[PDB]
Design a protein around this ligand. Structure first.
Ligand SMILES: COCc1nnc(N)s1
Length: 119
């Protein structure tokens, strides 16, 4: 029932994601010199270094907010991909499966801890 435990659990999951070769396209903001129309399609760029910096600055209040930003990394790639003949989109799908598999207990434990706090 530790209400704060999610933060270190998310730091560890982010470390696992950076170790994954599938995170390579998502470890830093998309370069607009490489993808000049990126902001014409993507309203809110997001990447794993930005998520980690937001977490470390103490600017997430819950793992649900972190999860929303991570899910935006994947939805941005889906929106920006022209077809399945994309190593980057295929990496996003595997990485998303890995993230969802690991974030589920973080979210459940946090929500359980908050319910216990207001029992
Ligand atoms: C992550 O770099 C920008 C891109 N996003 N989806 C692509 N298929 S290329």
């Amino acid at each position: 029932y530790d209400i704060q435990a999610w933060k270190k659990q998310c730091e560890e999951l982010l470390n696992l994601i950076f170790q994954c070769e599938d995170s390579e396209p998502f470890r830093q903001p998309v370069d607009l010199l490489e993808y000049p129309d990126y902001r014409d399609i993507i309203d809110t760029p997001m990447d794993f270094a930005t998520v980690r910096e937001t977490l470390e600055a103490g600017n997430y209040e819950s793992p649900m907010e972190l999860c929303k930003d991570v899910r935006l990394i994947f939805s941005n790639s889906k929106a920006y991909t022209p077809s399945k003949r994309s190593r980057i989109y295929s990496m996003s799908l595997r990485l998303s499966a890995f993230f969802e598999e690991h974030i589920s207990s973080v979210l459940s434990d946090y929500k359980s801890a908050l319910r216990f706090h207001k029992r």
